[PDB]
Amino acid sequence: MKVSLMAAKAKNGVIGCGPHIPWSAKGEQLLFKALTYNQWLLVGRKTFESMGALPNRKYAVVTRSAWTADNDNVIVFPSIEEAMYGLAELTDHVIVSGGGEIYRETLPMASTLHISTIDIEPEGDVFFPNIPNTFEVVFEQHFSSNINYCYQIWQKG
Amino acid sequence: MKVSLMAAKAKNGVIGCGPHIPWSAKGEQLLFKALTYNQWLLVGRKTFESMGALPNRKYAVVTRSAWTADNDNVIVFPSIEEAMYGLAELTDHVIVSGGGEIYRETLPMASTLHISTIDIEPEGDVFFPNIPNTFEVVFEQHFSSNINYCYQIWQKG
Numbered sequence: 001m002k003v004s005l006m007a008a009k010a011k012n013g014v015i016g017c018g019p020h021i022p023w024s025a026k027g028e029q030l031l032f033k034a035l036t037y038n039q040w041l042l043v044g045r046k047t048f049e050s051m052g053a054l055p056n057r058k059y060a061v062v063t064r065s066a067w068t069a070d071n072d073n074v075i076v077f078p079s080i081e082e083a084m085y086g087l088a089e090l091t092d093h094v095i096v097s098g099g100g101e102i103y104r105e106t107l108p109m110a111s112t113l114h115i116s117t118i119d120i121e122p123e124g125d126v127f128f129p130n131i132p133n134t135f136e137v138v139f140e141q142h143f144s145s146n147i148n149y150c151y152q153i154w155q156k157g
Numbered sequence: 158m159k160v161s162l163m164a165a166k167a168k169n170g171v172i173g174c175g176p177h178i179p180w181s182a183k184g185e186q187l188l189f190k191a192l193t194y195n196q197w198l199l200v201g202r203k204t205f206e207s208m209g210a211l212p213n214r215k216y217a218v219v220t221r222s223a224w225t226a227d228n229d230n231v232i233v234f235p236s237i238e239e240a241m242y243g244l245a246e247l248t249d250h251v252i253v254s255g256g257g258e259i260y261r262e263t264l265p266m267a268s269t270l271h272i273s274t275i276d277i278e279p280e281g282d283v284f285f286p287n288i289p290n291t292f293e294v295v296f297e298q299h300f301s302s303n304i305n306y307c308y309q310i311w312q313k314g
């Protein structure tokens with residue numbers, strides 16, 4: 001199965017200040033809605049709880065705890081390893097859609113990054129990992145909004 | 158300024174049966190909405206009338222008549238050269254968003270294509286031109302829907 005990764009980070013690499021995103025870049029989330037439509041996503045438990053489920057997406061949620069989910073559209077996995085083995089029988093394609101921890105543990109398995117950088121440098125204590133130079137930008141487009149943002153697609157070369 | 162082009166075509170190349178699109182693929186238009194967000198779009202006058210202005214988007218519309226719009230978000234030009242010269246004072250980027258005529262006229266200026274191919278072969282007045290080998294696919298993603306669709310980004314090689 002193909003592993004993609006989709007994130008939005010500030011220019012200082014912040015993705016998270018506790019359970020919040022410390023910015024609202026009007027329009028950016030349309031990109032996430034476009035590329036996740038009828039896809040399978042892999043999310044950490046904290047990101048899943050803070051951001052909720054959208055319709056027309058399936059979720060693999062990883063926890064080390066006894067946490068569970070009423071949603072029929074969700075499968076809980078005890079590890080990333082297990083989620084990958086599971087997903088591989090359920091889909092051609094999974095989009096890793098966050099957690100700091102999840103991004104750190106999955107970035108090496110990804111063949112395509114969808115990265116949005118927001119024109120702000122806010123307070124924060126979760127950070128996107130460093131992008132290995134095995135990856136190259138193949139597409140980029142700037143957006144003007146309340147806070148500008150840059151969308152880039154990276155492929156593993 | 159960089160010229161992109163964004164289109165959605167059936168597998169047989171149909172983009173239009175008169176002023177309608179002969180199909181509705183749930184999900185696909187999210188990609189159009191996310192990539193045109195707060196961008197300048199170049200549209201022919203026929204497409205503009207049949208499909209209407211969207212909010213949060215700027216329009217360069219070309220006519221060979223004295224046709225005009227009812228919208229301070231719209232600039233009418235008598236030619237594509239005039240539209241380009243005018244836009245270049247306002248923006249580093251324009252997305253050509255159709256007409257069959259417009260696509261044919263502008264494909265030679267475009268350095269990035271955003272092409273959605275819908276899994277259907279309907280009847281069609283209007284067709285997307287053939288993609289010259291001057292361009293190469295740099296990204297691709299498949300979507301399952303009521304009608305499946307494939308999204309590809311082509312760059313000028």
Ligand SMILES: COc1cc(Cc2cnc(N)nc2N)cc(OC)c1OC
Nearest residue numbers: 006007008029032051052054097098116
């Ligand atoms: C996993 O849950 C969501 C996460 C995000 C964050 C996010 C926002 N933008 C981009 N490009 N990638 C992301 N991962 C955004 C969301 O909706 C806009 C989510 O709703 C399901």
Ligand SMILES: COc1cc(Cc2cnc(N)nc2N)cc(OC)c1OC
Nearest residue numbers: 163164165186189208209211254255273
């Ligand atoms: C020119 O305005 C629109 C055009 C289209 C057709 C279209 C649909 N999908 C893609 N990817 N590109 C397109 N050009 C679709 C639209 O709405 C979903 C438009 O907004 C009114």
